[PDB]
Structures are given as C-alpha cells and as structure tokens.
Design a protein around this ligand. Structure first.
Ligand SMILES: N[C@@H](CCC(=O)O)C(=O)O
Lengths: 49, 51
C-alpha cells in the first residue's frame, strides 16, 4: 500500500508471498521446528518407597 | 560460461549462488542450502577421569 518501501524483518520466502512482492537472497537459511516444554523430573520425599 | 555466451538458457546442477556469478547470470531462488564446510576424520575419544 506504499506505507513501507522495505520489510527488514524475518519474512520467509513463500510462493504466495513472492507473487505480489519481490524478495531477496535470504539472510538466514532455516525451516520450521516444534518448540515444547522440557520435562522437569519432579521428586517427592517418599520416592524411595 | 555456457549461459554467458548464450549457448543455453539455464544451467541446472550444483551451481552455488555468489556475487561474482550473479553479476553476469541471473540466479533463481536457492532450492537447497549449501556453503563451505570442513570434513575431517573423527578424533580419538578420551574418557574423562572422575566419571
Ligand atoms: N558447487 C560449487 C563447486 C564445488 C565447490 O564448492 O568447490 C560451484 O558450483 O561452483
């Protein structure tokens, strides 16, 4: 819409996106991964029983 | 050099994008990431005392 002349941000190069705007050569080569919560081992006082 | 001299349209292969080539030939989007890496044989593992 002309509000911004550039997008200096983590914009992934998509097929649908690239149809309308013109990207550049990537800075970071990366994909998608899953972030989970590390399983904290909780211990009680009667764990030996 | 065979795209520079108009001998062909595209050069499909293991060509890496870099500034020197991209100033003389048009490169498409990288369809696979590569770069520079060092390959060596594995070292001899040492078991730390107090294990
Ligand atoms: N793939 C490289 C050659 C191999 C290398 O990295 O030395 C190129 O297209 O120029």
């Amino acid at each position: 819409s002309g509000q911004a002349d550039m997008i200096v941000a983590p914009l992934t190069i998509n097929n649908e996106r690239a149809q309308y705007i013109e990207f550049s050569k990537p800075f970071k080569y990366q994909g998608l991964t899953i972030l989970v919560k590390k399983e904290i081992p909780r211990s009680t006082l009667d764990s030996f029983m | 050099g065979e795209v520079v001299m108009k001998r062909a349209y595209m050069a499909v292969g293991s060509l890496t994008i870099n500034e020197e080539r991209s100033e003389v030939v048009d490169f498409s989007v990288p369809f696979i990431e590569t770069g520079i890496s060092v390959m060596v044989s594995r070292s001899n593992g040492t078991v730390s005392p107090s294990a």
